[PDB]
Amino acid sequence: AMASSESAFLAQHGLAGKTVEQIVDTIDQTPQSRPLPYSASITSTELKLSDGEQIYTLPLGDKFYLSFAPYEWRTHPCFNHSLSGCQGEMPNKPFTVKVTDSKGAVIVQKEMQSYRNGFIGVWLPRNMEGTLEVSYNGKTASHAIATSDDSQTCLTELPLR
Amino acid sequence: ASSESAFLAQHGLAGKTVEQIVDTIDQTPPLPYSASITSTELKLSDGEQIYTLPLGDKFYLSFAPYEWRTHPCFNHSLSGCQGEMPNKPFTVKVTDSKGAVIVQKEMQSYRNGFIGVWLPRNMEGTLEVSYNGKTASHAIATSDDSQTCLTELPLR
Ligand SMILES: [Cl-]
């Protein structure tokens, strides 16, 4: 009969009518310093949103979201990515990004720009295992990744050497 | 925890992707809640409040082949007029405007007489359904304002 607080939250933060990917992309890529006015974190299966004590959960779709932040000097640990609170070391930098699965298939291969928050997000098939490689100005980092339901959505262990 | 998050947990929708939730609902063999799907979201209600779950990259189209009788339908929901041919085998083909075959599958209609397909967004094309040497066809589109229910499929 009446609009939920959850539905109203969506409407007031610019998120109504968007697909869940567009919502995640919009939030992760917002060109503001952190923290954002509301909290947002992402797991293998849910986007969690909050205006205060109260939490809304939006199911993800067919694709797993991995957000990673390459670094040169220092890093911080991360399991589920905070779209609203975390700052990576390298904002607005051009990277070359390659994701390859366990049987050699290239899933991602392109030039990507890190966001204001220093992260890059990719949308990946679920239940794969593979490798992410990142490269910047002659330097590279790589790390094993997986996209099962218990896999992390945040990868910060990418020291460029 | 919000009314919304609790609702999902309580009805065992927690940790499912939005496609799994839609599939579960549409394919159920008497859900204690209401549900309606649009081009861009799933609406859920407990009768007091309405929750909205954004869909993903694919459009959900639910359709009902028929032989003798049919009913008009805008967006697909649990309530309203149901389909006509429950738990039957069909062969479903979807071709896009440039002739690419998008789906070609044998699919079983659900207890409500519908079949659901997940399609790329912003495409136009044709849906064709076969059953016992009879066929039905209809133009379809998956734009942000297209309907998610198609009942105009007379098997002939
Ligand atoms: Cl709510």
Side-chain angles (χ1 to χ4, degrees), chain B residues 45-91:
Chain B
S45 184
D46 60 7
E48 303 291 345
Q49 298 189 73
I50 308 156
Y51 311 108
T52 50
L53 314 182
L55 264 22
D57 287 336
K58 284 178 187 303
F59 189 99
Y60 189 72
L61 173 65
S62 206
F63 58 94
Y66 75 98
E67 293 176 283
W68 333 280
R69 61 171 192 287
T70 191
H71 321 294
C73 180
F74 290 157
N75 280 339
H76 187 54
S77 65
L78 287 170
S79 62
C81 291
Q82 304 303 290
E84 293 80 26
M85 308 180 71
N87 307 115
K88 289 182 199 153
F90 297 88
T91 296

Tab-separated table of all heavy atoms in Angstrom, chain B residues 45-91:
chain	number	residue	atom	x	y	z
B	45	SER	N	5.414	-6.635	-2.094
B	45	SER	CA	4.622	-6.031	-1.023
B	45	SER	C	4.118	-7.016	0.020
B	45	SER	O	3.765	-8.160	-0.295
B	45	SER	CB	3.469	-5.205	-1.592
B	45	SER	OG	2.765	-4.565	-0.535
B	46	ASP	N	4.098	-6.564	1.270
B	46	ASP	CA	3.490	-7.327	2.355
B	46	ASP	C	2.085	-6.812	2.673
B	46	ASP	O	1.485	-7.211	3.678
B	46	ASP	CB	4.375	-7.291	3.617
B	46	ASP	CG	4.608	-5.875	4.153
B	46	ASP	OD1	3.997	-4.902	3.654
B	46	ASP	OD2	5.420	-5.728	5.095
B	47	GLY	N	1.558	-5.930	1.823
B	47	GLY	CA	0.235	-5.358	2.043
B	47	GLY	C	0.242	-4.024	2.788
B	47	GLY	O	-0.703	-3.237	2.689
B	48	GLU	N	1.313	-3.757	3.529
B	48	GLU	CA	1.460	-2.472	4.223
B	48	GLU	C	2.494	-1.592	3.518
B	48	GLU	O	2.318	-0.383	3.393
B	48	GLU	CB	1.893	-2.694	5.674
B	48	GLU	CG	0.950	-3.569	6.481
B	48	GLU	CD	-0.388	-2.891	6.746
B	48	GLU	OE1	-0.477	-1.651	6.564
B	48	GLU	OE2	-1.345	-3.595	7.147
B	49	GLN	N	3.575	-2.213	3.050
B	49	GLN	CA	4.649	-1.466	2.410
B	49	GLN	C	5.066	-2.085	1.093
B	49	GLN	O	4.815	-3.261	0.849
B	49	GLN	CB	5.862	-1.410	3.325
B	49	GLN	CG	5.606	-0.700	4.624
B	49	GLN	CD	6.873	-0.491	5.384
B	49	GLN	OE1	7.693	0.344	5.011
B	49	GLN	NE2	7.062	-1.264	6.449
B	50	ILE	N	5.703	-1.279	0.249
B	50	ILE	CA	6.184	-1.749	-1.049
B	50	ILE	C	7.696	-1.613	-1.094
B	50	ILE	O	8.232	-0.550	-0.813
B	50	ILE	CB	5.599	-0.929	-2.199
B	50	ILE	CG1	4.072	-0.869	-2.081
B	50	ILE	CG2	6.019	-1.527	-3.566
B	50	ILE	CD1	3.450	0.333	-2.776
B	51	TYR	N	8.377	-2.693	-1.449
B	51	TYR	CA	9.833	-2.701	-1.531
B	51	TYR	C	10.177	-2.804	-3.002
B	51	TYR	O	9.442	-3.429	-3.765
B	51	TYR	CB	10.373	-3.913	-0.773
B	51	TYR	CG	9.763	-4.023	0.609
B	51	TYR	CD1	8.834	-5.012	0.912
B	51	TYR	CD2	10.090	-3.104	1.595
B	51	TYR	CE1	8.266	-5.090	2.182
B	51	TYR	CE2	9.536	-3.178	2.859
B	51	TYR	CZ	8.626	-4.166	3.149
B	51	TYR	OH	8.076	-4.216	4.422
B	52	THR	N	11.277	-2.180	-3.407
B	52	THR	CA	11.666	-2.178	-4.807
B	52	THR	C	13.089	-2.675	-4.950
B	52	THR	O	14.024	-2.098	-4.374
B	52	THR	CB	11.580	-0.767	-5.397
B	52	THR	OG1	12.261	0.145	-4.529
B	52	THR	CG2	10.126	-0.328	-5.501
B	53	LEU	N	13.262	-3.746	-5.716
B	53	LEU	CA	14.588	-4.296	-5.947
B	53	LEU	C	14.940	-4.073	-7.415
B	53	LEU	O	14.308	-4.644	-8.297
B	53	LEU	CB	14.624	-5.795	-5.627
B	53	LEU	CG	13.991	-6.342	-4.338
B	53	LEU	CD1	14.189	-7.858	-4.212
B	53	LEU	CD2	14.499	-5.657	-3.097
B	54	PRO	N	15.943	-3.231	-7.677
B	54	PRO	CA	16.441	-2.981	-9.028
B	54	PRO	C	16.820	-4.276	-9.730
B	54	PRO	O	17.474	-5.144	-9.144
B	54	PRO	CB	17.698	-2.146	-8.774
B	54	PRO	CG	17.370	-1.398	-7.513
B	54	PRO	CD	16.649	-2.411	-6.673
B	55	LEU	N	16.402	-4.411	-10.978
B	55	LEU	CA	16.859	-5.524	-11.794
B	55	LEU	C	18.292	-5.271	-12.246
B	55	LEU	O	18.855	-4.203	-11.991
B	55	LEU	CB	15.952	-5.681	-13.007
B	55	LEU	CG	14.799	-6.685	-12.953
B	55	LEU	CD1	14.382	-7.021	-11.558
B	55	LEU	CD2	13.630	-6.158	-13.767
B	56	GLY	N	18.875	-6.258	-12.920
B	56	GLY	CA	20.242	-6.169	-13.412
B	56	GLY	C	20.268	-5.836	-14.892
B	56	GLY	O	19.354	-5.174	-15.399
B	57	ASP	N	21.298	-6.326	-15.576
B	57	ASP	CA	21.588	-5.985	-16.963
B	57	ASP	C	20.606	-6.560	-17.953
B	57	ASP	O	20.628	-6.187	-19.134
B	57	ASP	CB	22.949	-6.562	-17.363
B	57	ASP	CG	24.100	-5.834	-16.755
B	57	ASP	OD1	23.962	-4.647	-16.400
B	57	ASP	OD2	25.179	-6.463	-16.678
B	58	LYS	N	19.794	-7.518	-17.512
B	58	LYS	CA	18.859	-8.175	-18.417
B	58	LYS	C	17.391	-7.904	-18.103
B	58	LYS	O	16.976	-7.832	-16.934
B	58	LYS	CB	19.152	-9.675	-18.497
B	58	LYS	CG	20.397	-9.976	-19.368
B	58	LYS	CD	20.688	-11.450	-19.395
B	58	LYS	CE	22.005	-11.721	-20.115
B	58	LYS	NZ	21.984	-11.176	-21.511
B	59	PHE	N	16.627	-7.724	-19.173
B	59	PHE	CA	15.177	-7.550	-19.126
B	59	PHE	C	14.494	-8.899	-18.904
B	59	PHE	O	14.845	-9.890	-19.553
B	59	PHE	CB	14.755	-6.988	-20.489
B	59	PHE	CG	13.327	-6.540	-20.561
B	59	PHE	CD1	13.010	-5.195	-20.425
B	59	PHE	CD2	12.303	-7.452	-20.807
B	59	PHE	CE1	11.703	-4.770	-20.494
B	59	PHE	CE2	10.977	-7.028	-20.875
B	59	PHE	CZ	10.682	-5.684	-20.717
B	60	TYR	N	13.504	-8.943	-18.019
B	60	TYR	CA	12.706	-10.144	-17.833
B	60	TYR	C	11.377	-10.021	-18.536
B	60	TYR	O	10.581	-9.124	-18.248
B	60	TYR	CB	12.480	-10.406	-16.354
B	60	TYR	CG	11.845	-11.738	-16.035
B	60	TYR	CD1	12.567	-12.910	-16.172
B	60	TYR	CD2	10.541	-11.817	-15.553
B	60	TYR	CE1	12.018	-14.134	-15.861
B	60	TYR	CE2	9.970	-13.045	-15.239
B	60	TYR	CZ	10.723	-14.194	-15.386
B	60	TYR	OH	10.202	-15.427	-15.086
B	61	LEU	N	11.140	-10.921	-19.480
B	61	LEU	CA	9.872	-10.956	-20.202
B	61	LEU	C	9.180	-12.245	-19.838
B	61	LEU	O	9.756	-13.317	-19.983
B	61	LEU	CB	10.115	-10.920	-21.709
B	61	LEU	CG	8.854	-11.122	-22.561
B	61	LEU	CD1	7.871	-9.971	-22.367
B	61	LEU	CD2	9.220	-11.300	-24.035
B	62	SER	N	7.940	-12.155	-19.367
B	62	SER	CA	7.185	-13.354	-19.035
B	62	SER	C	6.042	-13.508	-20.042
B	62	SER	O	5.314	-12.554	-20.288
B	62	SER	CB	6.660	-13.254	-17.598
B	62	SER	OG	6.472	-14.555	-17.048
B	63	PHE	N	5.893	-14.691	-20.639
B	63	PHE	CA	4.879	-14.873	-21.675
B	63	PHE	C	4.051	-16.133	-21.514
B	63	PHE	O	4.480	-17.098	-20.864
B	63	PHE	CB	5.509	-14.822	-23.066
B	63	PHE	CG	6.580	-15.849	-23.292
B	63	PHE	CD1	6.265	-17.074	-23.872
B	63	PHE	CD2	7.906	-15.576	-22.966
B	63	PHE	CE1	7.250	-18.022	-24.099
B	63	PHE	CE2	8.904	-16.518	-23.197
B	63	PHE	CZ	8.572	-17.740	-23.768
B	64	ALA	N	2.863	-16.112	-22.121
B	64	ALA	CA	1.862	-17.163	-21.956
B	64	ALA	C	1.305	-17.595	-23.314
B	64	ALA	O	0.409	-16.943	-23.872
B	64	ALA	CB	0.708	-16.681	-21.029
B	65	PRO	N	1.832	-18.701	-23.854
B	65	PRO	CA	1.251	-19.233	-25.090
B	65	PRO	C	-0.176	-19.699	-24.813
B	65	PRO	O	-0.497	-20.109	-23.681
B	65	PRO	CB	2.144	-20.436	-25.413
B	65	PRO	CG	3.401	-20.265	-24.591
B	65	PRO	CD	2.951	-19.520	-23.353
B	66	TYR	N	-1.037	-19.632	-25.822
B	66	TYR	CA	-2.401	-20.138	-25.647
B	66	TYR	C	-2.940	-20.794	-26.902
B	66	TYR	O	-2.382	-20.625	-27.988
B	66	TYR	CB	-3.363	-19.046	-25.156
B	66	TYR	CG	-3.776	-18.027	-26.191
B	66	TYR	CD1	-4.986	-18.148	-26.871
B	66	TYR	CD2	-2.972	-16.932	-26.475
B	66	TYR	CE1	-5.375	-17.212	-27.815
B	66	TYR	CE2	-3.352	-15.994	-27.414
B	66	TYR	CZ	-4.560	-16.141	-28.078
B	66	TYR	OH	-4.943	-15.200	-29.006
B	67	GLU	N	-4.023	-21.550	-26.735
B	67	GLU	CA	-4.717	-22.177	-27.860
B	67	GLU	C	-6.090	-21.544	-28.117
B	67	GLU	O	-6.350	-21.064	-29.222
B	67	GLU	CB	-4.851	-23.688	-27.634
B	67	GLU	CG	-3.531	-24.438	-27.665
B	67	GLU	CD	-3.682	-25.914	-27.348
B	67	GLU	OE1	-3.841	-26.257	-26.155
B	67	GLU	OE2	-3.634	-26.732	-28.291
B	68	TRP	N	-6.951	-21.515	-27.097
B	68	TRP	CA	-8.344	-21.071	-27.285
B	68	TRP	C	-8.686	-19.730	-26.643
B	68	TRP	O	-9.461	-18.946	-27.202
B	68	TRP	CB	-9.333	-22.115	-26.749
B	68	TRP	CG	-8.821	-23.515	-26.756
B	68	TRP	CD1	-8.765	-24.361	-27.823
B	68	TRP	CD2	-8.319	-24.251	-25.630
B	68	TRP	NE1	-8.247	-25.575	-27.434
B	68	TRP	CE2	-7.963	-25.530	-26.094
B	68	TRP	CE3	-8.134	-23.950	-24.278
B	68	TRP	CZ2	-7.422	-26.509	-25.246
B	68	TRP	CZ3	-7.596	-24.922	-23.441
B	68	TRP	CH2	-7.247	-26.180	-23.926
B	69	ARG	N	-8.123	-19.477	-25.462
B	69	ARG	CA	-8.518	-18.330	-24.647
B	69	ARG	C	-7.284	-17.581	-24.146
B	69	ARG	O	-6.263	-18.199	-23.855
B	69	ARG	CB	-9.343	-18.819	-23.447
B	69	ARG	CG	-8.573	-19.781	-22.533
B	69	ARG	CD	-9.318	-20.084	-21.225
B	69	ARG	NE	-8.472	-20.775	-20.244
B	69	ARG	CZ	-8.097	-22.053	-20.332
B	69	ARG	NH1	-8.477	-22.794	-21.365
B	69	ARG	NH2	-7.335	-22.594	-19.383
B	70	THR	N	-7.376	-16.258	-24.046
B	70	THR	CA	-6.271	-15.454	-23.516
B	70	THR	C	-6.808	-14.203	-22.826
B	70	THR	O	-8.006	-13.904	-22.909
B	70	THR	CB	-5.256	-15.060	-24.621
B	70	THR	OG1	-4.064	-14.504	-24.035
B	70	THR	CG2	-5.876	-14.054	-25.592
B	71	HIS	N	-5.920	-13.486	-22.142
B	71	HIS	CA	-6.278	-12.285	-21.393
B	71	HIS	C	-5.187	-11.246	-21.614
B	71	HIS	O	-4.012	-11.597	-21.704
B	71	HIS	CB	-6.362	-12.585	-19.892
B	71	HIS	CG	-6.975	-13.914	-19.565
B	71	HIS	ND1	-8.297	-14.215	-19.832
B	71	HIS	CD2	-6.447	-15.020	-18.987
B	71	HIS	CE1	-8.553	-15.450	-19.437
B	71	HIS	NE2	-7.449	-15.963	-18.924
B	72	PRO	N	-5.566	-9.962	-21.696
B	72	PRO	CA	-4.543	-8.921	-21.836
B	72	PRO	C	-3.739	-8.778	-20.546
B	72	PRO	O	-4.229	-9.128	-19.461
B	72	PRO	CB	-5.364	-7.655	-22.101
B	72	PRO	CG	-6.683	-7.923	-21.438
B	72	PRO	CD	-6.928	-9.398	-21.625
B	73	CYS	N	-2.513	-8.276	-20.664
B	73	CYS	CA	-1.618	-8.218	-19.519
B	73	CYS	C	-0.615	-7.096	-19.763
B	73	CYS	O	-0.083	-6.978	-20.862
B	73	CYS	CB	-0.906	-9.571	-19.376
B	73	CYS	SG	0.284	-9.745	-18.007
B	74	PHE	N	-0.367	-6.257	-18.765
B	74	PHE	CA	0.662	-5.227	-18.926
B	74	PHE	C	1.997	-5.714	-18.382
B	74	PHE	O	2.763	-6.350	-19.093
B	74	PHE	CB	0.247	-3.923	-18.256
B	74	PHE	CG	-0.884	-3.219	-18.952
B	74	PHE	CD1	-1.683	-2.315	-18.258
B	74	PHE	CD2	-1.152	-3.459	-20.298
B	74	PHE	CE1	-2.737	-1.659	-18.892
B	74	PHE	CE2	-2.203	-2.810	-20.944
B	74	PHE	CZ	-2.996	-1.905	-20.236
B	75	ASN	N	2.270	-5.426	-17.116
B	75	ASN	CA	3.445	-5.991	-16.465
B	75	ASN	C	3.036	-7.278	-15.748
B	75	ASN	O	1.880	-7.431	-15.347
B	75	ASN	CB	4.072	-4.983	-15.489
B	75	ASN	CG	4.957	-3.935	-16.189
B	75	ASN	OD1	5.438	-4.136	-17.303
B	75	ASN	ND2	5.170	-2.815	-15.520
B	76	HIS	N	3.973	-8.207	-15.589
B	76	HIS	CA	3.673	-9.506	-14.984
B	76	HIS	C	3.621	-9.446	-13.456
B	76	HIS	O	4.479	-8.835	-12.830
B	76	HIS	CB	4.729	-10.518	-15.429
B	76	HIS	CG	4.447	-11.924	-15.008
B	76	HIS	ND1	3.256	-12.565	-15.285
B	76	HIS	CD2	5.214	-12.825	-14.346
B	76	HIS	CE1	3.301	-13.796	-14.807
B	76	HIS	NE2	4.480	-13.981	-14.238
B	77	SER	N	2.616	-10.074	-12.848
B	77	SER	CA	2.516	-10.122	-11.384
B	77	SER	C	2.012	-11.484	-10.906
B	77	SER	O	1.600	-12.302	-11.711
B	77	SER	CB	1.598	-9.002	-10.857
B	77	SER	OG	0.258	-9.188	-11.290
B	78	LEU	N	2.033	-11.722	-9.595
B	78	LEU	CA	1.458	-12.952	-9.035
B	78	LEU	C	-0.068	-12.953	-9.106
B	78	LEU	O	-0.688	-13.981	-9.387
B	78	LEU	CB	1.880	-13.135	-7.577
B	78	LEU	CG	3.320	-13.552	-7.295
B	78	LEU	CD1	3.612	-13.443	-5.799
B	78	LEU	CD2	3.535	-14.961	-7.767
B	79	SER	N	-0.674	-11.807	-8.831
B	79	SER	CA	-2.122	-11.678	-8.900
B	79	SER	C	-2.558	-11.322	-10.317
B	79	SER	O	-1.721	-11.017	-11.189
B	79	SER	CB	-2.592	-10.594	-7.939
B	79	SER	OG	-2.036	-9.347	-8.314
B	80	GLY	N	-3.874	-11.353	-10.530
B	80	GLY	CA	-4.473	-11.080	-11.824
B	80	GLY	C	-4.763	-12.343	-12.612
B	80	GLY	O	-4.643	-13.456	-12.087
B	81	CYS	N	-5.132	-12.175	-13.876
B	81	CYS	CA	-5.354	-13.322	-14.760
B	81	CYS	C	-4.083	-14.107	-15.018
B	81	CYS	O	-3.053	-13.543	-15.388
B	81	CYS	CB	-5.950	-12.882	-16.102
B	81	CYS	SG	-7.641	-12.318	-15.830
B	82	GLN	N	-4.166	-15.420	-14.846
B	82	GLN	CA	-3.014	-16.278	-15.080
B	82	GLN	C	-2.951	-16.712	-16.540
B	82	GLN	O	-3.698	-16.202	-17.372
B	82	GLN	CB	-3.077	-17.481	-14.145
B	82	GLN	CG	-3.159	-17.052	-12.689
B	82	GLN	CD	-1.994	-16.161	-12.291
B	82	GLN	OE1	-0.860	-16.623	-12.194
B	82	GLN	NE2	-2.265	-14.875	-12.076
B	83	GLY	N	-2.050	-17.634	-16.850
B	83	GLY	CA	-1.921	-18.149	-18.208
B	83	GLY	C	-2.920	-19.256	-18.470
B	83	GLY	O	-3.911	-19.386	-17.747
B	84	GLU	N	-2.669	-20.062	-19.496
B	84	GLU	CA	-3.624	-21.095	-19.879
B	84	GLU	C	-3.026	-22.493	-19.956
B	84	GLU	O	-3.748	-23.483	-19.838
B	84	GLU	CB	-4.253	-20.753	-21.229
B	84	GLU	CG	-5.141	-19.518	-21.197
B	84	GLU	CD	-4.346	-18.236	-21.263
B	84	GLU	OE1	-3.223	-18.268	-21.810
B	84	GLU	OE2	-4.844	-17.200	-20.776
B	85	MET	N	-1.716	-22.576	-20.164
B	85	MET	CA	-1.084	-23.861	-20.467
B	85	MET	C	0.035	-24.197	-19.492
B	85	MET	O	1.215	-24.096	-19.830
B	85	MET	CB	-0.535	-23.851	-21.890
B	85	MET	CG	-1.552	-23.427	-22.918
B	85	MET	SD	-0.782	-23.424	-24.707
B	85	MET	CE	-0.599	-25.356	-24.967
B	86	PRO	N	-0.334	-24.624	-18.281
B	86	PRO	CA	0.640	-24.871	-17.216
B	86	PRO	C	1.402	-26.182	-17.374
B	86	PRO	O	0.848	-27.179	-17.835
B	86	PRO	CB	-0.235	-24.922	-15.959
B	86	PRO	CG	-1.563	-25.427	-16.446
B	86	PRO	CD	-1.723	-24.863	-17.837
B	87	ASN	N	2.670	-26.159	-16.986
B	87	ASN	CA	3.533	-27.341	-17.002
B	87	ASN	C	3.527	-28.094	-18.336
B	87	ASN	O	3.280	-29.300	-18.369
B	87	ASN	CB	3.178	-28.286	-15.844
B	87	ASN	CG	3.184	-27.588	-14.493
B	87	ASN	OD1	2.148	-27.463	-13.841
B	87	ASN	ND2	4.355	-27.134	-14.064
B	88	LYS	N	3.788	-27.375	-19.425
B	88	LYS	CA	3.875	-27.982	-20.751
B	88	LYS	C	5.206	-27.637	-21.420
B	88	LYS	O	5.829	-26.626	-21.091
B	88	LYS	CB	2.692	-27.553	-21.627
B	88	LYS	CG	1.345	-28.164	-21.209
B	88	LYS	CD	0.224	-27.743	-22.151
B	88	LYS	CE	-1.168	-27.942	-21.520
B	88	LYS	NZ	-2.213	-26.995	-22.073
B	89	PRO	N	5.664	-28.492	-22.353
B	89	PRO	CA	6.939	-28.243	-23.037
B	89	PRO	C	6.790	-27.335	-24.263
B	89	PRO	O	5.908	-27.544	-25.099
B	89	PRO	CB	7.377	-29.652	-23.460
B	89	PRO	CG	6.079	-30.366	-23.723
B	89	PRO	CD	5.082	-29.797	-22.728
B	90	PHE	N	7.638	-26.317	-24.363
B	90	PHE	CA	7.613	-25.422	-25.516
B	90	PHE	C	9.017	-25.277	-26.064
B	90	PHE	O	9.991	-25.507	-25.351
B	90	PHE	CB	7.092	-24.030	-25.126
B	90	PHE	CG	5.681	-24.024	-24.625
B	90	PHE	CD1	5.413	-24.232	-23.280
B	90	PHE	CD2	4.620	-23.790	-25.490
B	90	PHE	CE1	4.108	-24.226	-22.806
B	90	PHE	CE2	3.304	-23.776	-25.017
B	90	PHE	CZ	3.054	-23.995	-23.671
B	91	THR	N	9.125	-24.903	-27.332
B	91	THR	CA	10.414	-24.508	-27.871
B	91	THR	C	10.345	-23.032	-28.168
B	91	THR	O	9.484	-22.587	-28.926
B	91	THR	CB	10.779	-25.291	-29.144
B	91	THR	OG1	10.920	-26.676	-28.808
B	91	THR	CG2	12.081	-24.788	-29.709
